[PDB]
Amino acid sequence: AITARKRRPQVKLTAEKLLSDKGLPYVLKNAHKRIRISSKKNSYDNLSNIIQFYQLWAHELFPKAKFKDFMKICQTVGKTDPVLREYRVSLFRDEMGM
Amino acid sequence: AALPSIQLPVDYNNLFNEITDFLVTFKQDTLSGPKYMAMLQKVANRELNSVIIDLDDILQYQNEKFLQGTQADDLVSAIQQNANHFTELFCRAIDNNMPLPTKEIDYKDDVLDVILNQRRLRNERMLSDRELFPPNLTRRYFLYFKPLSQN
């Protein structure tokens, strides 16, 4: 019987991983706590105040890709997964149920 | 590339046990804790950076054990024959046995303590589902074999 023959394993960002606790639930837990926007600061600083959280979260979730590439993959997988669509509409369904 | 293999008159699991038993047992009682555990306590307090192993002590330990009737496998002859390996064995015995410090040393300024503490915190988070190092990194002392005196 067959003694082993090799193959190359691979990993990428995926909707299940993006739906794990360290994915979007981490955002719902931490984003409103960590981002703060104020009229007391210029636009560049406020934009950075948004971006710093999402960049650190994106790295800690999936350290392979650059932040811009991460955003592109997030947009495309968001465009093309039913589970992620269900979760996303479920957030606003919950807000509608408030 | 395969290799043949042979049997030899040595067993390092056994000699490791012999070494650690020596290390926790011996003292120079004729001069009236165990000598080496006291020296390791001095290492723990970072007052001493060298461990000097005496082959005279291993001889007297062998003589005591042989007087008590057990065989002792002549560790002196073994570690005169292949001393390089036995530095590693003695350091493993020390890195197991070495006690905690009795005196405080302002520990927070030690880089290797800080870096391995940060590693341990991260590994606790990993192990909470949210060796630790190569041993030489944590081994501050240096170990030396002192020869047999002529007698």
Add this chain to the structure above:
Amino acid sequence: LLKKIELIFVNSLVVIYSELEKITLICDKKKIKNFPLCRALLRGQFPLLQKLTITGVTFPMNNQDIMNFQWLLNFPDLKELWIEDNDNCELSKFLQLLKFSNVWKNLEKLTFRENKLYPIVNLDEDQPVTNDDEVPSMLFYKENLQNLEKLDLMGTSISGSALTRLCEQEYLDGRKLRSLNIGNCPNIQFPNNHAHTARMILDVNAVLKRLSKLEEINLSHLSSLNDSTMKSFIINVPFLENLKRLDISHNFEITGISIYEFLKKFQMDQPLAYLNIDGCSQVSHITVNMIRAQNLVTQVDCVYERDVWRKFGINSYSYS
């Protein structure tokens, strides 16, 4: 309805079974870090199980019932046992089982191969008495091993005296034994060696007297078989007239001198049927060409470049 089941657990990711006849469990020892059928094998019975083959698994440390082969008592009628590279097993615990139960009415073949060098095992011939006013414990080595045709102990750290005692006690039957593999056993020394501890000696003269009708010997990786030690085989040629197939390959010591004079005295018996000396760096090419030319062996293999011996399926069920 399943009679023969095989599982080859190539990777890891995170009651009565009368039907069964052959269970083959093979594992990638690097990837598999436990023992799959542990609960099933110890709890259940497989009463018609003819052959069992477990390789590459790792026995748990937390369970002396596993380590002492206590489960293995579950399977009478077990015509063959093969067990190989089971990293936390020991031949010592196995022989302790064999001491204290008539565990098997019949083994036609036994094959045990632990991987790492556990300490010396001697045949534990101690027959204790609870009191001399009470029976000595009947030692079941004879009736357990009396049936064997094939005994294979490659790599198992058995001492040479242990095997002689198996023959002097006639626990190994001889009249039924046909193939013996003791390769890669570092605790074997032959009588001509001046350097030893006496209980590592193999008395090949006694052994070959006992079990003379055997066909197939394997001494591969038996580095202790230097040219001087081969002289013991030369003088014991009269006791191995049944021998057809001789594997002594991957011996880095054995010069072509011993090979040649062994085949020459064997020729005083008609060639030896088959001989394997792959990887033996010291057999001179002209000598083995003489062996072919003068036709002292019907087939002889001299693939000097063959680094390893474990042909999967043929020689071993350890995975890859």
